[model samples]
Target: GSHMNPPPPETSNPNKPKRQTNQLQYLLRVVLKTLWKHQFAWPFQQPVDAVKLNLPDYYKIIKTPMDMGTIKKRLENNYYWNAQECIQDFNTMFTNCYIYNKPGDDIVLMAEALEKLFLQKINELPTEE
Candidate 1:
């Protein structure tokens, strides 16, 4: 009896069925990746150094915080936001970043990418929870 630990009991099932739940988790993860590849590839994968949103000097500040803000109105600022406010603030950032980043002759396709594919996927991710 030189061993430091005792042996485990044999009360547990040795031939129980292997878990089937993991398959669905893997499927969801793969499907999301594939969806990103075919539908959201090309421009979205890269984040620009300077986000382009056309506005006056004051409203222009929205980008800095909208990019950095957290829940509960932010501890440093004199503001309060509900869930939807935080959600839509980001929604506008993506919408604006695309528009100002690209425009004119490319507006049609960018809008399609922004509206049809990119926005939905950003919201769909289980990023927070």
Candidate 2:
């Protein structure tokens, strides 16, 4: 008897799957919006404008070159353990204080933090990667 090849898996209807996923996303957004609306009055305070003072931009401008320099120095010095520790510490600090909220800085702070975190995690990634 000749060996027989198993049939290929059934392919999904491309449009149907995408449409269902999009519908679910739309429903999720609607539900979240309703929940957020109910909680809107819990803390009605505007946040201080961290960007207005140009603090964020200034920090990036100074930190980028400094970080590169530190990375290079650590590599040259064979300071692998210290370098890894430094990177982990920086990551923790970035995650912790990146979404800071002062006593009155709820709404604006939340918006800013969401935007920053989203950009960092998603928007900055290469499209093809």
The number of the candidate with the highest TM-score is: 1
Off by over 4 Å in 2: 1-18, 22-30, 39-98, 102-129
Worst 10 residues of 2 by lDDT: 1-10
* Residue 41 in model 2: lDDT: 21
| lDDT per model vs. reference | 0.36, 0.32
lDDT of 2 at 113: 49
| CA displacement after TM-score superposition, residue 78 of candidate 1 (Å) | 28
For each candidate, what TM-score against the reference?
A: 0.31, 0.20
lDDT for 79 (candidate 2): 37
